[model samples]
Target: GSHMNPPPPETSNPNKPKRQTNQLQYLLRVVLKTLWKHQFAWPFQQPVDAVKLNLPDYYKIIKTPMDMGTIKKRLENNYYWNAQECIQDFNTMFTNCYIYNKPGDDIVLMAEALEKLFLQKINELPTEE
Candidate 1:
């Protein structure tokens, strides 16, 4: 065997991270599109209208309300540093539904279904190295 050691990581390749960031962003876009096209997505697309929907206690209970449209905007606007941050928003949206609605309500069931779908989609994303 040769005595020579492999070169050190002195040549930092920023392109790897840059390219991976782009990849993550594109993958998230696909996931978002899939979710938006789902039938259950209609109710989650827009922010909850507390006054119009007569949910006066909504804002009081949920300090940080989240929605699919807001998540899309956040992704497109570069508000997230990674895909997990975007996913956390999804979790928050579902949790908010679970907290506000009765367990057996149609909306809560939809949230359960959609949250399962989201988990399935996110698992397909590439893991960090």
Candidate 2:
């Protein structure tokens, strides 16, 4: 017969603090690495200048949209329930798409501009729930 037993009591140690595994540490590392890698790539790769690109340019591309509807559709398709996931997905998609299609000289400015636009959109979202 299997009997349920009470869990062992936690003993406090004066010299050593209790160490718990941190999932956030790995997430933080991934985020930091992504930031640094993008920064490094910015100077070398080209990005599609969203401001300069015509409406047709956006229409031609599947993921290039400056509208909320596009974001909503993307979130729906990807099953992203949160804003952070949607934003990250959009950023990665745009970054990779721009890098693949843009020229060398336009890379840094375009990347910076795109990043700015992303931040602006994020800031505009309602914060108080």
Which has the greatest lDDT?
1
- Best-matching candidate per TM-score: 1
Task: Give lDDT tens digits, candidate 1, residues 22-67.
Answer: 5357546777888888888999987787766777777778776788
lDDT of 1: 0.72
Per-residue lDDT of candidate 2, residues 58-109 (tens digit): 3245443322233333323333334454456547655654644655546446
- Per-residue lDDT, model 2, residue 96, is 53
Point out where model 2 deviates above 4 Å: 1-72, 76-78, 94-104
Instruction: Indicate the residue-level lDDT of 56 in model 1.
Output: 75
